[PDB]
Design a protein around this ligand. Structure first.
Ligand SMILES: *[C@@H]1O[C@H](CO)[C@@H](O)[C@H](O[C@@H]2O[C@H](CO)[C@@H](O[C@@H]3O[C@H](CO[C@H]4O[C@H](CO)[C@@H](O)[C@H](O)[C@@H]4O)[C@@H](O)[C@H](O[C@H]4O[C@H](CO)[C@@H](O)[C@H](O)[C@@H]4O)[C@@H]3O)[C@H](O)[C@H]2NC(C)=O)[C@H]1NC(C)=O
Ligand SMILES: *[C@@H]1O[C@H](CO)[C@@H](O[C@@H]2O[C@H](CO)[C@@H](O[C@@H]3O[C@H](CO[C@H]4O[C@H](CO)[C@@H](O)[C@H](O)[C@@H]4O)[C@@H](O)[C@H](O[C@H]4O[C@H](CO)[C@@H](O)[C@H](O)[C@@H]4O)[C@@H]3O)[C@H](O)[C@H]2NC(C)=O)[C@H](O)[C@H]1NC(C)=O
Ligand SMILES: *[C@@H]1O[C@H](CO)[C@@H](O[C@@H]2O[C@H](CO)[C@@H](O[C@@H]3O[C@H](CO)[C@@H](O)[C@H](O)[C@@H]3O)[C@H](O)[C@H]2NC(C)=O)[C@H](O)[C@H]1NC(C)=O
Ligand SMILES: *[C@@H]1O[C@H](CO)[C@@H](O[C@@H]2O[C@H](CO)[C@@H](O)[C@H](O)[C@H]2NC(C)=O)[C@H](O)[C@H]1NC(C)=O
Ligand SMILES: *[C@@H]1O[C@H](CO)[C@@H](O[C@@H]2O[C@H](CO)[C@@H](O)[C@H](O)[C@H]2NC(C)=O)[C@H](O)[C@H]1NC(C)=O
Ligand SMILES: *[C@@H]1O[C@H](CO)[C@@H](O[C@@H]2O[C@H](CO)[C@@H](O)[C@H](O)[C@H]2NC(C)=O)[C@H](O)[C@H]1NC(C)=O
Ligand SMILES: *[C@@H]1O[C@H](CO)[C@@H](O[C@@H]2O[C@H](CO)[C@@H](O)[C@H](O)[C@H]2NC(C)=O)[C@H](O)[C@H]1NC(C)=O
Ligand SMILES: *[C@@H]1O[C@H](CO)[C@@H](O[C@@H]2O[C@H](CO)[C@@H](O)[C@H](O)[C@H]2NC(C)=O)[C@H](O)[C@H]1NC(C)=O
Ligand SMILES: *[C@@H]1O[C@H](CO)[C@@H](O)[C@H](O)[C@H]1NC(C)=O
Ligand SMILES: *[C@@H]1O[C@H](CO)[C@@H](O)[C@H](O)[C@H]1NC(C)=O
Ligand SMILES: *[C@@H]1O[C@H](CO)[C@@H](O)[C@H](O)[C@H]1NC(C)=O
Ligand SMILES: *[C@@H]1O[C@H](CO)[C@@H](O)[C@H](O)[C@H]1NC(C)=O
Ligand SMILES: [Ca+2]
Ligand SMILES: [Ca+2]
Ligand code: NI
Lengths: 6, 71, 5, 141, 424, 5, 636, 71
């Protein structure tokens, strides 16, 4: 999972 | 799909030896050149007295029968 | 289709 | 591909096919944004409006004494005189999805020879004609 | 904070009295930390790249930290008068944990070694230890307020996959994992007594422990303060507080009062947000006004000096308004039923607004003086070149009753031109 | 049917 | 600059002294400067004269001001007030309905545009007296988005006018009779077309005409000459006329016409104007059907889709050119057509909203007898070309001997259940008058029978998967709500009334039995136990009853009304015997097998069995009257 | 922790250079077997996406679209 919450 | 390692006592120093491999890795062994623990095999003398197949048991050679037939 | 009112 | 030149620029939004009258040495083109067909000399002079009040000209060809145009709206192929654009005639109407036009006719390569025709097998791959009856050889990409 | 709505809410712990705190000007709020001593509210916005502070009721919003803030995620507070300190985490290039006194004066970096994607922060108040987490190196650690005595509470353990946020209570630590989609429990000193608290269908992002021990009481230094607008707790000087005021206010020489900044600023419209930036090229704060987040397709903006309103259009064919403070974000009036509008121009003298709708190919006028909205089409696409082809921009001269608009061409109709007309 | 656009 | 990703500042006198304010900014758009614009340093007529105009004040050069009004309002001669528009054109397109002033100069929207979700407007018509605009939506997918709706020109009082019984192809034309308050419209199905009348603000609606080979599409009405005209673009294109009741059909244009999709009336010269998009012309013809005159023709008129007439000029729309045109209505005129509005997508039709277009004085309308009060007529008044007395049309029932009232039909006719209602149908295929107004009932009515003595229909009524009941309703003058006869039954698929012993028999499908009762709901009895029974018929004179069993071991069986002597009349080659009827005049039994898709006849006891009609697709009920059989089909 | 992206090789001076643009942007230099790593530039660099060399002068050319730089 990529860090950017969006 | 990696191979990991850790300290045998407490599981410290946990690292991944490989990147993510393409297929799932299954089965693992060392290759060691030094001879492992050696003991005198009673099956090495007159087949331990057994008729067919034998292996060194805890106390002495245990005889065994083949996979085919009723014995 | 199936025979009902 | 050499000696690039700009002939006509200005009110040319939504340009359409250029076409050429080889005999008269004049260019014809349509401008959809103004709904006109324009004419000009090949040297970049005498630009003028020939046909106007068109909707969406798409195909354009000059043959004999006449100009043929397909108007994609109006769904029509029409024919008009190349001199001042009078004597309008409908060849076909209610044609959906009109596009380009061209006139199939016999052309004599003997009466319009150039450098490449006068010198066959001169170039290994491609021969391209050059003004003054010369020719420049070319190679594939 | 709601990411889709772009709002901050609050409720009682029994689920009653759900009420809005910030209704506007949030894009991606990562973490919230309330100041229970100074009655302030601190949060980090990923999109705006700022650390912001407000009164706890949302009233007076200002940008606290803006210089080298790339991707702020974490945020923790120690409002006890002895400490009066703040912490935040940034996971941009050169990731780090930063320490600063609230009001953002005494800014320092405490952790920058062996860090990559820092995420989540919490304070052990009794020991004054800042716990922090890592999503790339996959560890949980803690250290002193100065970054010394750095220690590992979970490290080189496969159970961390992508931890996000963190919480402490007595001798337990709890954290949310976006990878395993779980919230976990472990002993906050050696990680040794691990269990799953619960399994979540979606990614669990935020966590907090509701308990009086998590907010120790402290004597309030700002109780006797006479500062107008914001009063922030500070770690410097015996006073231990500093007066501040929202975006677009001076600090007065008498350091307790603030006056509204009447100087101009440039409103920069961008596809999904509107920024007010200072006309001075050296000032790179992007805080001349509270940003207007949640724009669908931003092209043009327009303002009214009186009432300090900012106007823009939206996709469904309507016009929206907001104060420069954010306080009154509402849909103003239905604009046109025949498609979206592009251009805006406001007649401030006569309280009219002019807009162009390329969908209907017309220039229309709308009133904003009375209670009832009245709309009319001024110029429409007739056959003649003098009409409207495809209107892009629009400018007005109320003093001389002239209207100007930039127009693309139409086939066989209007040419691409700059046109002028009377405002009627 | 003619026009369902 | 959106590609340089930069905001830059330069001198206003020259591009010199460039300064970057911001760089690396994605998706840059407009710029504007928030500053202290003062409302007092700059002044105009509107600021000097507050609340001078009612709605909108617009400043003009020289410090003056001009008042303006919202869309659908125009300035009063006083120059301060607003009034609703009185004279404007109604232009209809697929996405919206819009109104333009009949004077090209005023560009204002003379009407609040009808648009938004669910608008697929095909045609529009106006009611100038009451101030209404009628339009028809059409959707080939959603059945809800089909029908006729109306609205005020100012956007208030939205209403669905017609929503039930629209065909697959939808409403294809609407024309309002402003004198009688009739609304003629064309309802188009897959292989046939209806013309219908609805009287405004009433529930009265009837069919005037049904055609399969012809297909009326666009319809106009003229209350001044008392004629109705429609355009046909089917396999035999024509322009067609009738009286206002669709009786006296005659063909005005039959040659040199392909796909006419627009009609218009002059009302002053008595010409019929039409647009033809396959021959690319606009032509006109007189009422008496003389020789057609070409108004406009050639390549420059590729798709004229709709036309209207106002004063000395015709107005038409073009789908290809996306323009609305105005030109002289007189044939042989060569002036270029004046453009009103262009780049309008999906143009459909144009109509005039004016008092002159819809006169109401008897002096203008040649003393139309419907003006006074519907001609004194109970349902519909239809004025005729020369008679000074109106013909009275009846929406339901039969016209009284007085010639103006309507009452329930005394003739013989069919009755059938249609979901939550009981419908009626004359035996005459070309008689479109309903013998009685439809009865609304709760649940779904499955099977029915008529009691001649008390003038009632007994009918079964399904409530859910397991709930059913039996009710009845009277056909006597006045009305009466349906009254439950016996509740607490399973689903009932069949019912039969004995006129000799005054008993009601029915088939309980859930309970797998044949039951009986007195006609007053007392004395319930069980006649037989049958797996899945559907239909019942009775022969009280011979004391025999027949009923149908479908499913496993399907058969037609006979017993006495007592139910002792059960014998199977027919049991070879049957699967789903849904229908059963008896022809008492000829002593024959008729049944419908819905699985084998056929109707068969036999003697009583099943001798000389033969097919009456093969490929009757999926029959449910059947009945015999005169020399014909009638059946309901569940598939079609 | 590092992320080499764009790598160039130099047989004349016998080195590898790569750009990083990761969490700690840098341009690195190493021997032709990746031994003996060194950082050439770590300051004023954010997103180096391409390296280049002139063999006759031995200058490393790189571009950076985050500073809008060619250095
Ligand atoms: C069918 O049902 C629909 C359901 O809504 C009804 O709309 C419709 O009924 C009504 O039809 C009448 C037809 O006359 C309409 O009445 C007329 O309204 C006009 C508008 O009135 C407004 O503007 C005038 C401007 O001066 C103002 O004075 C009014 O106060 C109002 O704001 C009005 O101009 C017109 O007046 C004429 O007729 C009067 C009859 O008494 C005269 O007194 C007057 O001098 C003048 O000659 C009239 O009153 C009515 O609007 C309409 N209903 C609605 C709600 O719109 C039904 N009819 C059909 C078959 O369509
Ligand atoms: C809250 O705090 C802000 C920020 O400090 C203050 O904003 C400044 O306000 C002053 C006074 O209005 C502004 O000064 C005026 O600037 C005009 C144009 O800008 C020039 O200067 C800026 C800044 O250096 C440059 O970017 C730009 O290129 C220009 O060079 C000048 O035209 C004005 O000159 C006029 O007045 C002066 C006297 O002040 C005369 O000498 C001149 O002859 C002339 O008549 C003037 O210099 C300043 O630019 C503002 N800065 C910003 C950031 O906008 C607010 O004023 C303060 N709030 C309050 C109410 O005090
Ligand atoms: C959910 O919890 C909230 C918070 O406890 C309840 O709302 C209100 O809480 C206050 C707490 O003091 C209750 O006391 C009142 O306080 C005021 C303080 O000025 C005092 O003047 C009153 O006399 C009173 O003591 C207050 O009654 C309560 N409000 C209501 C509606 O009762 C809330 O009630 C809780 N909701 C539920 C569902 O239990
Ligand atoms: C914000 O970032 C800049 C750039 O990294 C910082 O400026 C550097 O600061 C160090 C001291 O820590 C100096 O040695 C460098 O020479 C500076 N570099 C440049 C290019 O200026 C600056 O200190 C930071 N400012 C704040 C508010 O933290
Ligand atoms: C987890 O909880 C257990 C008890 O459930 C704790 O167990 C003792 O820990 C000490 C210190 O590591 C060991 O030397 C003892 O042998 C443990 N006792 C027993 C009964 O097993 C433990 O401290 C907790 N944490 C860890 C790291 O396991
Ligand atoms: C802007 O928003 C404020 C806050 O909602 C509005 O003030 C409220 O107005 C209502 C209606 O009159 C009152 O009942 C409330 O008591 C007001 N609250 C406060 C805090 O004043 C205000 O009217 C809005 N202004 C505009 C013009 O949009
Ligand atoms: C058919 O009859 C039923 C009642 O027996 C009508 O009622 C609706 O039934 C549907 C389910 O089929 C429900 O979802 C609705 O809530 C019911 N109420 C209404 C009034 O819609 C139904 O409308 C009838 N349908 C037709 C087309 O005749
Ligand atoms: C179908 O009906 C026939 C009568 O038409 C039945 O035939 C009779 O069956 C009974 C059974 O007890 C016999 O006693 C009779 O002698 C039969 N008569 C004739 C003429 O065959 C028959 O049983 C029924 N069942 C089926 C499916 O054939
Ligand atoms: C028509 O609209 C007016 C104004 O909205 C409303 O008061 C009235 O009740 C409406 N009439 C009907 C019949 O719906
Ligand atoms: C219309 O029908 C009448 C009989 O009602 C008949 O006399 C007349 O000829 C018909 N009209 C025309 C124009 O034929
Ligand atoms: C069905 O038959 C039973 C007797 O077996 C009777 O008692 C009952 O009322 C009937 N109705 C239903 C639907 O149960
Ligand atoms: C190469 O590696 C050695 C050992 O790490 C180091 O001392 C030396 O400075 C490096 N560089 C060169 C050019 O040898
Ligand atoms: Ca990870
Ligand atoms: Ca055509
Ligand atoms: Ni084109």
């Amino acid at each position: 999972x990529x860090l950017x919450x969006x | 799909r990696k191979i990991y390692r850790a300290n045998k006592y407490d599981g410290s120093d946990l690292v991944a030896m490989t990147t993510r491999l393409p297929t799932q890795p299954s089965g693992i062994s060392t290759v060691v050149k030094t001879q492992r623990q050696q003991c005198s095999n009673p099956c090495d003398q007159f087949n331990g007295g057994c008729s067919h197949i034998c292996a060194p048991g805890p106390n002495g050679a245990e005889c065994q029968c083949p996979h085919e037939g009723n014995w | 289709x199936x025979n009902x009112x | 591909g050499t000696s690039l030149k700009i002939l006509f620029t200005g009110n040319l939004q939504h340009l359409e096919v250029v076409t050429l009258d080889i005999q008269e040495q004049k260019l014809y083109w349509a401008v959809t944004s103004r709904g006109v067909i324009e004419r000009g000399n090949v040297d970049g002079t005498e630009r003028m409006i020939l046909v106007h009040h068109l909707a969406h000209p798409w195909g354009l060809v000059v043959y004999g004494s006449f100009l043929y145009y397909s108007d994609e709206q109006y769904e029509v192929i029409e024919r008009v005189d190349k001199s001042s654009g009078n004597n309008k005639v409908v060849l076909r109407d209610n044609v959906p999805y009109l596009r380009g036009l061209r006139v199939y006719h016999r052309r004599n390569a003997a009466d319009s020879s150039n450098g490449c025709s006068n010198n066959p097998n001169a170039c290994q791959q491609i021969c391209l004609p050059v003004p003054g009856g010369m020719f420049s050889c070319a190679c594939a990409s | 904070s709601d990411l889709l709505q772009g709002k901050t809410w609050s409720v009682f712990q029994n689920g009653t009295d759900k009420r809005v705190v910030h209704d506007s000007g949030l894009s991606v709020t990562e973490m919230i930390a309330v100041d229970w001593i100074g009655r302030n509210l601190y949060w980090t916005d990923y999109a705006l790249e700022t650390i912001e502070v407000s009164k706890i009721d949302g009233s007076h919003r200002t940008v606290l930290i803006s210089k080298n803030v790339t991707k702020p995620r974490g945020l923790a507070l120690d409002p006890r008068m002895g400490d009066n300190v703040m912490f935040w985490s940034d996971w941009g290039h050169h990731p780090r944990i930063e320490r600063a006194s609230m009001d953002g004066t005494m800014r320092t970096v405490i952790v920058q070694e062996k860090i990559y994607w820092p995420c989540g922060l919490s304070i052990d108040y009794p020991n004054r230890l800042i716990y922090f987490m890592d999503a790339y190196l996959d560890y949980i650690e803690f250290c002193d307020y100065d970054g010394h005595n750095r220690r590992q509470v979970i490290a080189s353990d496969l159970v961390l996959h992508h931890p996000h946020a963190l919480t402490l209570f007595e001798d337990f630590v709890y954290w949310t994992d976006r990878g395993t989609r779980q919230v976990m429990q472990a002993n906050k000193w050696h990680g040794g007594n691990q269990s799953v608290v619960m399994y979540s269908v979606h990614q669990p992002l935020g966590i907090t422990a509701i308990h009086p021990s998590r907010q120790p009481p402290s004597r309030n230094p700002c109780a006797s303060a006479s500062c107008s607008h914001l009063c922030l707790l500070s770690a410097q000087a015996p006073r231990h507080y500093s007066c501040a005021c929202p975006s677009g206010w001076n600090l007065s020489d008498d350091s307790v009062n603030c006056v509204r900044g009447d100087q101009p600023f440039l409103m920069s419209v961008r596809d999904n947000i509107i920024f007010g930036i200072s006309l001075d090229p050296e000032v790179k704060s992007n805080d001349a006004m509270v940003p207007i987040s949640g724009i669908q397709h931003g092209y043009d903006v327009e303002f009214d000096d009186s009432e300090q309103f900012i106007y823009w259009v939206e996709n469904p064919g309507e016009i929206h308004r907001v104060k420069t403070d954010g306080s009154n974000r509402t849909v103003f009036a239905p604009l046109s039923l025949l498609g979206s509008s592009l251009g805006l121009a406001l007649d401030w003298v006569s309280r009219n607004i002019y807009y162009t709708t390329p969908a209907s190919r017309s220039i229309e006028v709308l009133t904003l003086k009375g209670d009832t909205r009245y709309g009319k089409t001024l110029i429409a696409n007739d056959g003649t070149p003098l009409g409207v082809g495809f209107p892009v921009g629009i400018a007005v001269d109320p003093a001389r009753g002239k209207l100007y608009w930039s127009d693309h061409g139409t086939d066989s109709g209007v040419p691409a031109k700059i046109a002028s007309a009377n405002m009627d | 049917x003619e026009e369902x656009x | 600059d959106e590609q340089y990703e930069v905001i830059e500042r330069v001198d206003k006198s020259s591009g010199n002294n460039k300064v970057v304010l911001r760089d690396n900014v994605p998706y840059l758009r407009g710029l504007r400067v928030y500053h202290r614009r003062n409302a007092a340093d700059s002044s105009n007529g509107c600021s000097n004269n507050p609340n001078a105009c009612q709605q909108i004040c617009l400043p003009v050069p020289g410090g003056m001001f001009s008042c303006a009004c919202a869309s659908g309002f125009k300035l009063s001669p006083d120059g301060r007030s607003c009034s609703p528009y009185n004279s404007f054109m109604v232009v209809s397109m697929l996405p919206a309905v819009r109104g333009f002033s009949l004077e090209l100069s005023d560009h204002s929207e003379a009407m609040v545009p009808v648009a938004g979700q669910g608008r697929n407007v095909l045609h529009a018509d106006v009611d100038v007296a009451n101030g209404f605009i009628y339009w028809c939506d059409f959707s080939s997918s959603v059945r809800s988005s089909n029908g006729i709706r109306r609205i005020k020109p100012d956007g208030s009082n939205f209403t669905n006018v017609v929503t039930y019984g629209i065909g697959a192809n939808g409403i294809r034309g609407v024309a309002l009779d402003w004198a009688a308050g009739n609304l003629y419209f064309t309802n188009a199905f897959v292989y046939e077309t209806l013309i219908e009348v609805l009287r405004i603000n009433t529930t009265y609606r009837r069919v005037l005409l049904k055609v399969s080979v012809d297909m009326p599409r666009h319809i106009i009405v003229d209350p001044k000459h008392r004629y109705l005209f429609w355009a046909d673009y089917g396999q035999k294109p024509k322009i067609e006329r009738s009286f206002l009741d669709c009786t006296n059909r005659t063909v005005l244009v039959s040659e040199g016409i392909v796909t006419p999709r627009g009609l218009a009336m002059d009302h002053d010269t008595g010409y019929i104007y039409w647009v033809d998009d396959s021959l690319d012309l606009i032509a006109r013809i007189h009422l008496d059907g003389g020789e057609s005159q070409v108004v406009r023709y050639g390549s420059r008129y590729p798709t004229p889709y709709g036309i209207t007439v106002f004063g000395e000029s015709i107005i038409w729309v073009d789908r290809n050119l996306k323009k609305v045109f105005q030109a002289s209505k007189q044939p042989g005129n060569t002036d270029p057509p004046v453009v009103i509005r262009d780049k309008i997508n999906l143009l459909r039709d144009v109509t005039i909203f004016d008092e002159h277009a819809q006169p109401l004085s008897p002096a203008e309308l040649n003393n139309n007898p419907c003006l006074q009060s519907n001609g004194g007529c109970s349902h519909f008044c239809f004025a005729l070309p020369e008679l000074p007395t109106p013909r009275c049309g009846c929406a339901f029932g039969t016209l009284g001997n007085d010639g103006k009232s309507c009452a329930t039909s005394q003739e013989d006719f069919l009755i059938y259940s249609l979901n939550n209602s009981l419908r009626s149908l004359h035996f005459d295929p070309r008689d479109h008058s309903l013998p009685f107004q439809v009865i609304s009932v709760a649940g779904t009515a499955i099977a029915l029978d008529y009691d001649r003595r008390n003038n009632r229909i007994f009918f079964t009524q399904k409530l859910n998967s397991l709930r059913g009941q039996i009710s009845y309703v009277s056909l006597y003058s006045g009305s009466s709500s349906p009254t439950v006869l016996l509740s607490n039954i399973g689903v009932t698929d069949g019912i039969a009334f004995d006129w000799i012993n005054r008993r009601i028999y029915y088939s309980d499908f859930s309970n797998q039995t044949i039951n009986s009762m007195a006609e007053d709901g007392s004395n319930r009895a069980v006649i037989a136990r049958v797996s899945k029974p559907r239909a019942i018929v009775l022969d009280p004179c011979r004391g025999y009853m027949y009923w149908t069993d479908w499913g496993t071991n399907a058969k037609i069986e006979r017993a006495t009304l007592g139910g002792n002597f059960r014998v199977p009349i027919v049991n070879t080659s049957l699967v789903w015997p849904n229908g059963l009827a008896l022809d008492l005049e000829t002593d024959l039994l008729y049944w419908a097998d819905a699985s084998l898709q056929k109707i068969e006849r036999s003697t009583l006891t099943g001798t000389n069995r033969e097919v009456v009609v093969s490929t009757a697709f999926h029959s449910f009920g059947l009945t015999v009257y005169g020399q014909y059989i009638y059946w309901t089909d569940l598939y079609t």
